[PDB]
Design a protein around this ligand. Structure first.
Ligand SMILES: Nc1ncnc2c1ncn2[C@@H]1O[C@H](COP(=O)(O)OP(=O)(O)OP(=O)(O)O)[C@@H](O)[C@H]1O
Ligand SMILES: [Mg+2]
Lengths: 8, 336
């Protein structure tokens, strides 16, 4: 499973 | 510190909030409000203070004291694509990704970027090639959302992406079949995503422009109706058929096309449907017949303990397609 985070 | 964060989906049709908590996770509260027009435009938040007030209503309705949140960007704001890179230390990989991503991003690297390896990095040596999933968004898209959350008194811990967050409530079930190829479709109001997996590992994601709005708009056109009224007509009826037939055909073609391009560049046994656009009456059967993939609705709530004295299992089930993403975001909020 993929966990991304585009928080700066 | 270790917070249990809420899950929030800023949807184009509905703004949805889910609270989960406990050590095996349990549903505590949920709320949904229709999204007021003009607040979101093409993946951006055009009215952040007005969104902040809407999100405040949700927190009041849910009756929550929690003020940390995981939310998600619109699929129209994010570019998702895999990219081959050699394994390097982590800081070095970042620069390599940013360098490679530069070519695929139709605006100045102004971008926020993240990535995750499609296969475990520990299983390969330095310098060998690994596929990573890269996500990229305009800094402006991110800023609209953080400004919305700030007005609402919320602190974001993760800004996730919907095609994967929608999968979190299915993941234990997809891990049961580690070698089976599964398709998961989320038909939303603003986009449809497709994700192709083996077990619980994504293999590919594709986002289509076609979605629930297109069905409403064809009913609207065919009967000079307002959107809300075309929308209500869509829900109760589902001749309607004649108005929505070209949308059905076009969606079917776009989904056959995506699957054919998966098969060329990399094919589904079973699949799942999420998102409210997936509830159009009979759609599941149509798509099953037409794509040659057994496509089923699925209940995301099974991922979570549900107290029968506080929620009706029957009602939960009914709204499970719309709530898969907000529930995944809430599961993320309580990780690990
Ligand atoms: N029973 C139904 N029959 C047909 N269409 C439906 C039904 N229920 C909801 N829809 C459509 O589903 C869509 C809303 O679903 P959902 O809340 O999953 O979208 P959303 O998360 O707001 O959109 P997005 O993720 O694209 O921003 C609306 O387009 C609505 O018209
Ligand atoms: Mg959605």
């Amino acid at each position: 499973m993929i966990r991304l985070n585009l928080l700066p | 510190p270790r917070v249990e964060a809420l899950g929030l989906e800023i949807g184009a049709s509905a703004l949805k909030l889910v609270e989960v908590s406990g050590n095996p996770p349990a549903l505590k509260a949920l709320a949904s409000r229709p999204t007021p027009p003009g607040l979101l435009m093409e993946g951006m938040v055009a009215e952040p203070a007005a969104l902040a007030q809407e999100i405040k209503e949700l927190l009041l309705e849910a009756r929550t004291r929690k003020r940390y949140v995981v939310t998600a960007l619109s699929n129209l704001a994010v570019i998702l694509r895999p990219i081959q890179v050699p394994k390097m230390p982590l800081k070095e990989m970042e620069e390599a990704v940013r360098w490679e991503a530069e070519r695929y991003i139709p605006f100045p690297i102004e971008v926020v970027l993240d990535f995750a390896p499609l296969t475990p990095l520990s299983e390969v040596q330095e310098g060998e090639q690994v596929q990573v999933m890269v996500a990229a968004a305009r800094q402006e898209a991110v800023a609209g959302v953080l400004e919305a959350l700030r007005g609402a008194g919320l602190v974001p811990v993760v800004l996730d992406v919907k095609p994967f967050a929608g999968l979190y409530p299915l993941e234990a079930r997809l891990a049961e079949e580690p070698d089976r190829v599964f398709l998961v479709l989320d038909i939303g109001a603003e986009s449809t995503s497709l994700v192709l997996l083996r077990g619980d590992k994504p293999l590919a994601v594709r986002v289509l422009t076609l979605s629930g709005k297109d069905f409403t708009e064809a009913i609207a056109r065919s009967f000079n109706l307002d959107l809300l009224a075309a929308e209500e007509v869509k829900r109760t009826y589902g001749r309607i058929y004649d108005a929505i037939r070209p949308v059905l055909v076009e969606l079917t073609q776009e989904l056959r096309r995506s699957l054919e391009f998966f098969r060329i560049q990399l094919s589904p046994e079973v699949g799942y449907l999420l998102g409210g656009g997936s509830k159009l009456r009979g759609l599941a059967s149509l798509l099953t017949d037409t794509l040659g993939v057994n496509l089923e609705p699925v209940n995301p709530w099974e991922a979570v303990a549900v107290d029968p004295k506080r929620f009706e299992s029957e009602q939960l089930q009914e709204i499970g397609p719309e709530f898969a993403v907000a529930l995944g975001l809430a599961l993320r909020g309580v990780e690990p």
